[PDB]
Amino acid sequence: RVKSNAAKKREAKANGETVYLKRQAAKPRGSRIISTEGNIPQTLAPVAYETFI
Amino acid sequence: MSQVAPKWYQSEDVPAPKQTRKTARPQKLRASLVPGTVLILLAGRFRGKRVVYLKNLEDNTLLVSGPFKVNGVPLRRVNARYVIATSTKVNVSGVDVSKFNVEYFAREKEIKAERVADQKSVDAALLSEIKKTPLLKQYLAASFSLKNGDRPHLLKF
Amino acid sequence: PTRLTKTRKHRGNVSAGKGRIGKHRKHPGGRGKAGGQHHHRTNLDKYHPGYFGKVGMRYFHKQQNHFWRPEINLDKLWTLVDSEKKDEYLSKSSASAAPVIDTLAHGYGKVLGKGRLPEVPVIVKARFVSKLAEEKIRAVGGVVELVA
Amino acid sequence: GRDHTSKQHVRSGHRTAPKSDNVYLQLLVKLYSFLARRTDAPFNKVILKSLFLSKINRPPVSVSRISRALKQKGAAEKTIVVVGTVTDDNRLLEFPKATIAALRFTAGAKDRILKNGGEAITLDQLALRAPKGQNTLIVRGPRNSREAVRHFGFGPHKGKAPRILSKGRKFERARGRRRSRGFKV
Amino acid sequence: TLQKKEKAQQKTAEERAAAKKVRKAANKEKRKVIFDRAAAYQKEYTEAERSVIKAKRDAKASNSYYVDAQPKLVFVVRIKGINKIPPKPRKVLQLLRLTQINAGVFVRLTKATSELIKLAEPYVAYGYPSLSTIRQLVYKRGFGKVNKQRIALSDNAIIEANLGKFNILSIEDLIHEIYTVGPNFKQVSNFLWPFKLSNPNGGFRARKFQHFIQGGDTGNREQFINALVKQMN
Amino acid sequence: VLKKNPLKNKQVLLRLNPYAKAYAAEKVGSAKVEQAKVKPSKGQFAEVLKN
Amino acid sequence: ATSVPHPKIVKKYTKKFKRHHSDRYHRVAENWRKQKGIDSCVRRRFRGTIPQPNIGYGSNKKTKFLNPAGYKVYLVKNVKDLDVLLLHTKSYAAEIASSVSSRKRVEIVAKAKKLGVKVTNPKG
RNA sequence: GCCUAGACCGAGGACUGCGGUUACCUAGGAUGUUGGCAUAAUGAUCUUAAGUCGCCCGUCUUGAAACACGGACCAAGGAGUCUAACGUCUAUGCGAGUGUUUGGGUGUAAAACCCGUACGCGUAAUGAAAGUGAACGAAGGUGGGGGCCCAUUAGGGUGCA
RNA sequence: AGCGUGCUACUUAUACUUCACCGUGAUUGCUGUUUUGACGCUUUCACGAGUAGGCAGGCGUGGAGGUCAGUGACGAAGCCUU
Ligand SMILES: [Mg+2]
Ligand SMILES: [Mg+2]
Ligand SMILES: [Mg+2]
Ligand SMILES: [Mg+2]
Ligand SMILES: [Mg+2]
Ligand SMILES: [Mg+2]
Ligand SMILES: [Mg+2]
Ligand SMILES: [Mg+2]
Ligand SMILES: [Mg+2]
Ligand SMILES: [Mg+2]
Ligand SMILES: [Mg+2]
Ligand SMILES: [Mg+2]
Ligand SMILES: [Mg+2]
Ligand SMILES: [Mg+2]
Ligand SMILES: [Mg+2]
Ligand SMILES: [Mg+2]
Ligand SMILES: [Mg+2]
Ligand SMILES: [Mg+2]
Ligand SMILES: [Mg+2]
Ligand SMILES: [Mg+2]
Ligand SMILES: [Mg+2]
Ligand SMILES: [Mg+2]
Ligand SMILES: [Mg+2]
Ligand SMILES: [Mg+2]
Ligand SMILES: [Mg+2]
Ligand SMILES: [Mg+2]
Ligand SMILES: [Mg+2]
Ligand SMILES: [Mg+2]
Ligand SMILES: [Mg+2]
Ligand SMILES: [Mg+2]
Ligand SMILES: [Mg+2]
Ligand SMILES: [Mg+2]
Ligand SMILES: [Mg+2]
Ligand SMILES: [Mg+2]
Ligand SMILES: [Mg+2]
Ligand SMILES: [Mg+2]
Ligand SMILES: [Mg+2]
Ligand SMILES: [Mg+2]
Ligand SMILES: [Mg+2]
Ligand SMILES: [Mg+2]
Ligand SMILES: [Mg+2]
Ligand SMILES: [Mg+2]
Ligand SMILES: [Mg+2]
Ligand SMILES: [Mg+2]
Ligand SMILES: [Mg+2]
Ligand SMILES: [Mg+2]
Ligand SMILES: [Mg+2]
Ligand SMILES: [Mg+2]
Ligand SMILES: [Mg+2]
Ligand SMILES: [Mg+2]
Ligand SMILES: [Mg+2]
Ligand SMILES: [Mg+2]
Ligand SMILES: [Mg+2]
Ligand SMILES: [Mg+2]
Ligand SMILES: [Mg+2]
Ligand SMILES: [Mg+2]
Ligand SMILES: [Mg+2]
């Protein structure tokens, strides 16, 4: 990670731009759209009790 | 108490008060308080008396007359919080109340000739307008009291 | 003064700062140096090692006057020169005429060699000198004269 | 109620005034309380704190320490500041011309500074020729050279000095100080 | 001395009047800046709301499902007293600056802070605060940590003097930085003294110390944190 | 010496937020949204009613 | 308030703090003593027990030491003792010592009236 | 956005600040007015009644109101002291020295004042002892280090403890 | 007015919010206006349980040096007393 930060910093320095090297914890996910072509929702219900012995 | 002498740094000068920003604003009266409204007095000598409201003085008080002939309540001031404002109204547009103010009721038994003359002059117009409504003079001449089973939170006035 | 002691502040509190369970008994643990090998070993071993046992040989009738030999180092040797004439001696001293410092007459038995001398000849009279003390005196052009 | 993350009602643990009731030391505190409060110079804030210190926290500064501090490169004409007593050193071979401001001077110290062309001034005289401590150099004496420190942190294999009244072969040298007598610590 | 002190007071009054004239003239521009900033914040709030609404409607129309972006901010209120807390949740509550009952703090949701709040979960009620809730909190009970002292946020100069290096010049800049979790959320939320709320007007549920899901008060209530804060602030 | 609530004191509200005046002037608290009368759920979203 | 103006005087506790069981036993005087016992109901602050002195009852620093008339009271034993109250006649009142004779007490009252000093015990 | 009912509070005490309306303000803490009282309305205490709560203190104890122990009552007396030698800390005097008080001088006579040789401790340690006995160097190098010097964010120099 | 369960309102701890006052700790500033208190004045914030025990600041007693040219037979000390 030290090498990667050094490589990324010089590359941003080479391109004259900035790069952020601090690690981040996992963030909450963004918005998204769920396609339903081939994936129409299937309805589930709780199942009755059975004995299998 | 003890033997502790005052020190030189214990000053006796009284500081001035800070500049107050409590600029007074005019009194708001209840919507039911309209000149000519019949009022019920709740405290004082004339408690229970039904009287006519005439003018809002600059002292935040109400100018009131009985009329004196019907009630025995003369021209005087009352406080708005010691008054029940009923819904009965008398046309007082024909009553001249220009000369009445705070300085009229200034403290100096007997009674001024001016005050007696004003009583008669006001009561003439007041009686003239009162006669139009039947039983209004009788209503004004009768005292108010709470009967058994009277709930002031349920009664309309 | 008694008015400053904590005995005056403990008045009114039952146990006088001694505890309600432990109390202030006569001599718990013994008197004096009792139990130094059994229940006070942890104290003597930690803070006073070497306490128990014999080391070395005895010396019947030891007279400490025999071993009297106060030490003076070289950095303090010129303090025995007269204060009113020290600066003159520091200037006019040569091989032909150097100040005499009688160390025994000032109460010293041995001259030791800590520190540095002025590069100035001196005549030092001593009962004893160290090897390095005499080497430093000769280097500044001085000499050591043994006395008794 | 509060879940306290630190101890409540805790004094700073630093002296804010001298323990001494000497009125003349108070005058010096009077002067440097004003200077530290108003000059933004870090020198004046250090001096005010040093005036509070106890006797063992202001060890004497020998005239040899001042000589060695003046022998730093570019420090030969600096003003030596000692918040405490300046003592003499009869082991010096020579002393330079210097200006030294101290709480106290010994007779030998005052003689030696003035003999070599220097000045021995007080700390109030310092505040007029150097109200911000310009071109100064604070010298502190050895704190760990005290005799009481010899016995601090004593223990097995600690190498400190035992608290003992007499010294000799019969005094705390046998068991625990020698492998021939059991163990050695 | 009467005329001496009157002359000095009138002279210093004139100097103060001139300096205040100049100061107000200079500050007018700064107030225009913060006015523009607040207007822009309102505009972007409205634009984002309408954009999300439109995206939901379009996904509904186009046989799809718009999944909302996960919340980036949470408001955590300690609703439990200070007695009988195990060392690890006690340390977690101390590090969240929740050292009394009814203390509130803003937390930016990631993984480290989420696992922190999970450790303190049986002792706190938390949720996702709305913009009006943040505004009301900061306006009524907003305090700053100035030289380790709790100072009321009664003037924008205090906020500027403490957060201008983070581009916070107004109380609305601070509210925006909290709400839309900004690059300086850490400094702005740590500058904010923990909110010291009252008890709810209307009470809690019959038994607080059980999860919001099971009919209690602890855990994540999400949009009902706004009603709870309305009760308690 | 005495904290005043900007949600109660209008002068303090204008002192802290100068944009509140425009908010009041523009009736931002009751601003209408202009849009068409549409219903985009007529199709597959009726999977909510039954399945 | 005929003295230098002061805030309204507040006394947090107006009764006497009486030592526990100074009512049960004659040997126990009413002078306050703090209970130090391990089981003491008063030291443990049980509900229904007597109030105890603590720093919370301390007087307002602006009304502390002021008598009901608004003055701080200074003890006077002779006529020369009134000299320290010359510039404090509106904030300090004089109280004549009990052991001053009936002759010298008349002189103190006479000079105090001349100087404007108020006397808290003017009759005895 | 608007209207409306009630309760508690009024700390501060010339001015200083931020805003608003554009001089004034509701904007860094209550003012205005009226009535009554000053032989008193008001406040405090004591006694007592009522309501509510309140078990006997001290002690040893994990646990005492305990069916654990002392205590019928009262007054007076009544228990961490002084000394020899010491540790830490602090104040003071002098300082590589320090300590006049064993003694001598002196005296207004157990005081105060004055005097000095020795001696104690310190200034050298280590070894069982015979014995030996502290500068390679600017009294050492390295990394920090308050303060000081040169600068000009930064940077450099010097750097006591 | 029991049991299981849901709901609306309501009751009140020395707990929470705001405020007054006390103390502790910190803190802002205070000498050409420091000005007969700088061991002092002042701004601000937070906090306050406690046996054994520690420390600090105070109350009281016998006697001593100094001082009040202090009280007192025209009434000291002591004692009784809403
Ligand atoms: Mg970068
Ligand atoms: Mg009739
Ligand atoms: Mg105590
Ligand atoms: Mg104690
Ligand atoms: Mg105790
Ligand atoms: Mg006892
Ligand atoms: Mg005790
Ligand atoms: Mg003890
Ligand atoms: Mg006992
Ligand atoms: Mg014990
Ligand atoms: Mg054994
Ligand atoms: Mg001998
Ligand atoms: Mg030897
Ligand atoms: Mg040593
Ligand atoms: Mg936080
Ligand atoms: Mg309610
Ligand atoms: Mg409820
Ligand atoms: Mg609820
Ligand atoms: Mg409940
Ligand atoms: Mg319940
Ligand atoms: Mg509320
Ligand atoms: Mg009292
Ligand atoms: Mg009392
Ligand atoms: Mg009361
Ligand atoms: Mg009794
Ligand atoms: Mg117990
Ligand atoms: Mg008597
Ligand atoms: Mg006031
Ligand atoms: Mg004009
Ligand atoms: Mg205002
Ligand atoms: Mg009971
Ligand atoms: Mg027992
Ligand atoms: Mg036992
Ligand atoms: Mg038992
Ligand atoms: Mg018991
Ligand atoms: Mg039993
Ligand atoms: Mg027993
Ligand atoms: Mg028995
Ligand atoms: Mg027994
Ligand atoms: Mg018994
Ligand atoms: Mg018995
Ligand atoms: Mg003598
Ligand atoms: Mg004699
Ligand atoms: Mg000697
Ligand atoms: Mg029941
Ligand atoms: Mg139920
Ligand atoms: Mg039920
Ligand atoms: Mg409910
Ligand atoms: Mg109060
Ligand atoms: Mg201070
Ligand atoms: Mg003072
Ligand atoms: Mg508390
Ligand atoms: Mg306490
Ligand atoms: Mg005494
Ligand atoms: Mg005695
Ligand atoms: Mg005496
Ligand atoms: Mg009696």
UniProtKB/Swiss-Prot annotation, chain G:
Q: Molecular function terms in GO for this entry? A: structural constituent of ribosome
Does this entry carry the keyword Ribonucleoprotein? yes
Ribonucleoprotein as UniProt keyword: yes
Q: Which GO terms describe its biological process?
A: translation
SUPFAM superfamilies the record matches: Ribosomal protein L32e (SSF52042)
Q: Which UniProt keywords apply?
A: Ribonucleoprotein, Ribosomal protein
Question: Pfam families this protein is in?
Answer: Ribosomal_L32e
Q: Which GO terms describe its cellular component?
A: cytosolic large ribosomal subunit
Give the record's family classification.
Answer: Belongs to the eukaryotic ribosomal protein eL32 family.
Q: Which PANTHER family match?
A: 60S RIBOSOMAL PROTEIN L32 AND DNA-DIRECTED RNA POLYMERASE II, SUBUNIT N, RIBOSOMAL PROTEIN L32
What is the name of this protein?
Answer: Large ribosomal subunit protein eL32
Organism for this UniProt entry? Candida albicans
